[PDB]
A paper describes a structure:
Phosphatidylethanolamine (PE), a major component of the cellular membrane across all domains of life, is synthesized exclusively by membrane-anchored phosphatidylserine decarboxylase (PSD) in most bacteria. PSD is translated as an inactive proenzyme and undergoes self-cleavage between a conserved Gly-Ser pair to become an active αβ-heterodimer. This maturation step results in the post-translational modification of the N-terminus serine to pyruvoyl in the α-subunit, which is an indispensable prosthetic group for decarboxylation activity. After the proenzyme undergoes auto-proteolysis, an active complex is formed between the α- and β-chains, which are mainly responsible for catalytic activity and membrane association, respectively.
Using native and selenomethionine-derivatized recombinant PSD1–287, the crystal structures of apo PSD1–287 were determined from two crystal forms at resolutions of 1.90 and 2.63 Å, which are described as Apo-PSD1 and Apo-PSD2, respectively. The asymmetric unit of Apo-PSD1 contains two αβ-heterodimers, whereas that of Apo-PSD2 contains four. No detergent molecules were modeled in Apo-PSD2 structure. The N-terminal pyruvoyl residue (Pvl-254) of the α-subunit was unambiguously identified in both apo structures. Gly-253 of the β subunit, which is no longer connected to Pvl-254 after auto-cleavage, is approximately 12.6 Å apart when the distance between two Cαs is measured, and it forms a salt bridge with the side chain of Arg-221. Consequently, Pvl-254, which is located at the base of the funnel-shaped active site, is open for substrate binding. The biological assembly of PSD1–287 appears to be a dimer of αβ-heterodimers, (αβ)2, which is commonly identified in all four structures presented herein.
Residue numbers in the entry:
A (entry chain B): 254 to 292
B (entry chain D): 254 to 287
C (entry chain A): 8 to 253
D (entry chain C): 14 to 253
The structure:
Amino acid sequence: XTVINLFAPGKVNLVEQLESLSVTKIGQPLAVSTGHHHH
Amino acid sequence: XTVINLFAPGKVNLVEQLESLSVTKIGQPLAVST
Amino acid sequence: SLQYILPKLWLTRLAGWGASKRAGWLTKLVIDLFVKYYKVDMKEAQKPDTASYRTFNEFFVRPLRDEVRPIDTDPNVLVMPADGVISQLGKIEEDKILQAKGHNYSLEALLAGNYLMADLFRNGTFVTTYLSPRDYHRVHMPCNGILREMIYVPGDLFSVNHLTAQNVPNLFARNERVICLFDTEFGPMAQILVGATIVGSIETVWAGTITPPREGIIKRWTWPAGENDGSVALLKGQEMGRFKLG
Amino acid sequence: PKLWLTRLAGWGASKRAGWLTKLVIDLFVKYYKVDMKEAQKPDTASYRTFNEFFVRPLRDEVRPIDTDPNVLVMPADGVISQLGKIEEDKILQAKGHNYSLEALLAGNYLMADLFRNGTFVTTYLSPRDYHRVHMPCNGILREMIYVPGDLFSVNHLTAQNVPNLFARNERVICLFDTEFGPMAQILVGATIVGSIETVWAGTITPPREGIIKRWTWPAGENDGSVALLKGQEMGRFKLG
């Protein structure tokens, strides 16, 4: 096995589609930052 | 089992008589303030 | 449940002894039986030939082909750190984290009584990802980070699965684990590797094998902020650690 | 299988079995040489369960508390295991076994730093001895931490041979404010004698839920503060 992530309050929103038993693949979106970054 | 005491640095001196396997009671002197 | 009866540590050591031995045909036999029973997609592996693996562990910790796990490049996106399925996720309700229907556990329990670390994450968000035996058993960074703190926590070796998660109280808070705290562009971020029966060995890329051995005490390491010399930085998608047997 | 043996003894020691209870108490008093003259109730028949006897109270007169307010007094009947200076973080267990102050305090680096280069005293309670623990001096209770752990035997033999024995065995850490600064008193359990109580919380263990729990209390001034006096009972060990 298990991996647990903790993020600080108001820092990220979890992708709304994700729920208990949703499949995870390394690199897929887990969350989007609540504050805007730019490349 | 066992009881461990911690005291802050330079706050107490242990009675010098006490050593490994010394008998302990419950009122007997353990240490004196500095 | 024989979860309280079974000598989980000796079974784990037995599997570790087993999984560490280079036994040619017997190694390929157990790897092959494993791949069949659990439905391992060996096509995703860097080396799909089950003969390529000297020990069972080499196979357990097998690397994937880079192209089959594309990393979302959007710097606004935090990515999944592990192959498997989400157990639970969402808001940390003050100190309370959801384990299952009608089982909560303490943020402070999970962080081995570390009230300062717990304070970073009160009313934050959590994600618990379960790695099934068929899945890739290395763990990757969800985003760029500077490693600041690592804590090894002695614990039980309960099985992790839907059944035990639904029935064993404080499962993740009492099982042997490694807490990693990073500075990120999203503030403090914890990534916690929780071991289980059999799959009980935890490694990180910066420290090697944390466990075994099992010395029975909490150990804490710290690293400086990114600026300073001796700082350890990792990139979104980069390997940070893995699970193997023992 | 130290946890099941400890549960077995706890089940045993909790049962009110008249003659079998007095028989095991009597065999115990004989084998270990218990001074029942010091007991409040010297009649081995007075004890409903083995545990009632294990946690037996002493006669009021027989443990006089040194009245000098600059003297800290012994908190438990038994023998000194080791004592002296904390060498930075290092505490002596026995010949060629050191243990970390931070390990003992379950990774609590802030608490450990109050006691770096301080003083330690490790007291061993033999089975014959009184199994309640008393305050070495006046204190305000500020912090109590329950630490999950192993149930290794504690004795000269295991102390000399098991690394980090006191840092890995199940225990209760109690931190007080005193006239002598911060003071920690730590109750470390063992095989069979694995139940720890405090006077302010009752039995901490069992049950064994496998997580660290921390309680805090306010400074002496504030409302809801808990004070104890030099010599006062703060906790005990029983079987289970």
